[PDB]
Amino acid sequence: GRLLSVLLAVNVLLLACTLISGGAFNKVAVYDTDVFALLTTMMLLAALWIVFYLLRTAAVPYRDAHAGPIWLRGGLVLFGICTLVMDVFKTGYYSSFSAIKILHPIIQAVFVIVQTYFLWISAKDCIHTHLDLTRCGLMFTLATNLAIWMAAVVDESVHQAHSTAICQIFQQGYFYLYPFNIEYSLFASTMLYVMWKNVGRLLETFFAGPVLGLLLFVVGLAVFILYEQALVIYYSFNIVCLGLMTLVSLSGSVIYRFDPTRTLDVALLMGAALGQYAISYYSIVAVVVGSPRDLQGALNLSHALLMIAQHTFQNVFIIESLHRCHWRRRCLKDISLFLLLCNVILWIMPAFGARPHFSNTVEVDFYGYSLWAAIVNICLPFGIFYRMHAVSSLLEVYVL
Amino acid sequence: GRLLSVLLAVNVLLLACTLISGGAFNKVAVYDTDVFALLTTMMLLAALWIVFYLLRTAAVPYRDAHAGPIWLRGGLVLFGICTLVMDVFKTGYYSSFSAIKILHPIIQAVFVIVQTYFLWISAKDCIHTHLDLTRCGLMFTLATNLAIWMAAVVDESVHQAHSTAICQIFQQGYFYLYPFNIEYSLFASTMLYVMWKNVGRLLETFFAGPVLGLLLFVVGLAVFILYEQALVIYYSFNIVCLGLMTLVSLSGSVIYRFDPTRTLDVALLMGAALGQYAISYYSIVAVVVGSPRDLQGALNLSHALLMIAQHTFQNVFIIESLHRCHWRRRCLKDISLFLLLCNVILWIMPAFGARPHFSNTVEVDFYGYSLWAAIVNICLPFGIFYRMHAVSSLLEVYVL
């Protein structure tokens, strides 16, 4: 049943994985035609099951509470809208001409609309019935989102590596919104998995931190808009933000030392941080084996090490605060604010920034454009997910 | 605790993964020096924990029964000995000259000896104490085996793609035993994971089948020794063996239709079959997008489809028999014998055969030598694992 559903998801996802990675990395010709045909079939079958579930459930005597956190649902709709805009540019590019290539955007739009509505209205639904059928359907939808994710990463790693009409605005706009589509796939997959296990079950502040964060929030805005090289202040600000975050988060852990449903929260928090760990690890290798000891190289190495340290210490601080000061209660409510404001800026740059991010120029010549682009496309969405999860967790700590 | 141990394993394995895949696929120079330094550190720390566990346990009031099946332990020792022989060729190649390169074989030999002894004498041990410390140690050892597995696959996919003294016998012999080392890593990882969850818990035949299998067993021997191209009888025999296996396994399912601790057994059986599914999927793509409709192409496509069908139907037959004929009880004991004999030959060819296997010549020009070799090295060990698991399961069915 559950194992069968898992096996099904894995087996069908494995079939998509070889089709996506076999027809794109072969030598004779790029066979992406069957990739779109299978992807269209997956969403159409996934959408058909979803509407069937909606029709037959218009069952769930008890409702979950932590299954649908607002940050998860909000990101799904925000990236779901971006996926719809991406599909508009998808069809807008198709102003020429194969048939399944044109079909793919429309069926994708229908699937994302239906899936977003279904997840919004059934995020915390504890299905007590049709357990056998729904588990396969939920897992099939989970594999569908991961199949789109895998295809999107491969498609991005091919067009970006290899770099008619007004299409330029339609093409580049379409290719700019891919990370948002990948973000939607990651956001849809985690909530589908949350519902899959949720089947057949019944269950005052100081005036120094926020101002420091707000100026960092304001200065962080002034940095990435400036670039919309010969600049080293982007690294300087990021080091200061990460360095301050590392010390501030660590200090909060010291204060606690001086004086349930969380399992998924830690797993998502620690698991999503692996995306930045991997990027930093590749960055560290590229600077100790590649570029010499220069200003840019030293700045990149310090930025990667500070990213690792900040992720680790913020994670341990959030974990400790989740488990749990006459004058330090206001301080504790103040530490969370500085990190929360500093997490939003560290969310904006990777998400809304350009695909060839500034903070990676050595790992470009060290790993090549294609390999480094693939690594970034695989890992950075986990960084965005971690940023949102950390913002939500810091809001929870402030509430507590 | 358990999650922390998992996180630890994942985090340290992720660090090894980027180091192995970053220092080998970069552009300036192949930085495998730090790969051996980290790998040596991992086993040395893993070996130190294992002997520490052995010394302090020379605790476990109750013993598991299905945790250490004989096929799992036997394969570990068989491939553990092969790993020791591989390490002998490893040091035997080092008849020149860096320092850690020479150290790596010796520490690997110590680690494999200690780990094989530890797994043999503690396969079914239900650790009721030191749960926190042992779980991290078991998971760290699990990541150590996977780190060696990942390094072995990358090392194999690099030397094979790029193709002094008598070393030729020392080098080629060393490079021939890599799949056995990878097999040991897969075998060590699964039993380490079996013990990780086993912490803090208290729990007559007919005369037509065997002769058909025995001649197929004998003929199968006569095939692969012949090659130790212009030959198409290897495909002809494999199709006959797989075709007969597909019909025989399916027929056994029909007879049943006419009239607990297994969760890991199905997961290992179905999960390991993914290795052959992936190889077949890549083979199917290479023949419908690449080579035209020729004798070799049609034979390869039929072989891949028959592999998929045989794996699926054998899996469902084994699963159904695990859940569970006045004159058909002898038949049921006879169906298992034909598949069991036919699984041994289908085990011998991928394991003891040459690295450029005969059954893949199109997926060579379609995917390139490097990509196809990497795919085969990733997937085929799962096929060998599945063959052994199927042999053990068919023996169990014959006993039942």
Numbering used by the authors:
A (entry chain A), B (entry chain B): 28 to 85, 90 to 128, 133 to 198, 231 to 270, 288 to 312, 324 to 354, 364 to 428, 487 to 562
Any passages from the paper?
The otopetrin (OTOP) proteins were recently characterized as extracellular proton-activated proton channels. Several recent OTOP channel structures demonstrated that the channels form a dimer with each subunit adopting a double-barrel architecture. In this study, we performed structural and functional characterization of the Caenorhabditis elegans OTOP8 (CeOTOP8) and mouse OTOP2 (mOTOP2) and illuminated a set of conformational changes related to the proton-conducting process in OTOP. Combining the structural information from both channels, we propose a working model describing the multi-step conformational changes during the proton conducting process.
Mouse OTOP2 was expressed in HEK293F cells and purified in glyco-diosgenin (GDN) detergent. Its single-particle cryo-EM structures were determined using protein samples prepared at various pH conditions (5.0, 7.0, 8.0, and 9.0). The structure from the major group of particles (3.22 Å) is similar to that determined at pH 5.0 (3.06 Å). Among all, the mOTOP2 structures determined at pH 5.0 and 8.0 are better resolved and will be used to represent the low and high pH structures, respectively, in the following discussion. The structure difference in mOTOP2 between low and high pH conditions is quite subtle and mainly occurs at the N-terminal half of TM6 preceding the highly conserved glutamate (Glu250 in mOTOP2) important for proton transfer. At low pH, TM6 of mOTOP2 forms a bent helix with a kink at Pro246 just one helical turn above Glu250 whose side chain, likely in a protonated state, is pinned to the center of the hydrophobic interface between the N- and C-barrels (left insets). In mOTOP2, however, the two equivalent residues (Glu250 and His551) are too far apart (with Cβ-to-Cβ distances of about 14.8 Å at high pH and 12.8 Å at low pH) to form a similar proton-transferring bridge by a simple side-chain movement, suggesting that conformational change is required to move them closer before they can engage in proton transfer. Firstly, the helix-to-loop transition at the N-terminal part of TM6 observed in mOTOP2 determines whether the glutamate is exposed to the extracellular solution for protonation or buried in the inter-barrel interface in a protonated state ready to contribute its proton to an acceptor. Once protonated, the loop-to-helix transition at the N-terminus of TM6 drives the proton-carrying glutamate side chain to the middle of the inter-barrel interface as depicted in state 2. The two conformations observed in mOTOP2 structures represent these first two states of the proton-conducting process, whereas the CeOTOP8 structures likely capture the next two states (states 3 and 4).
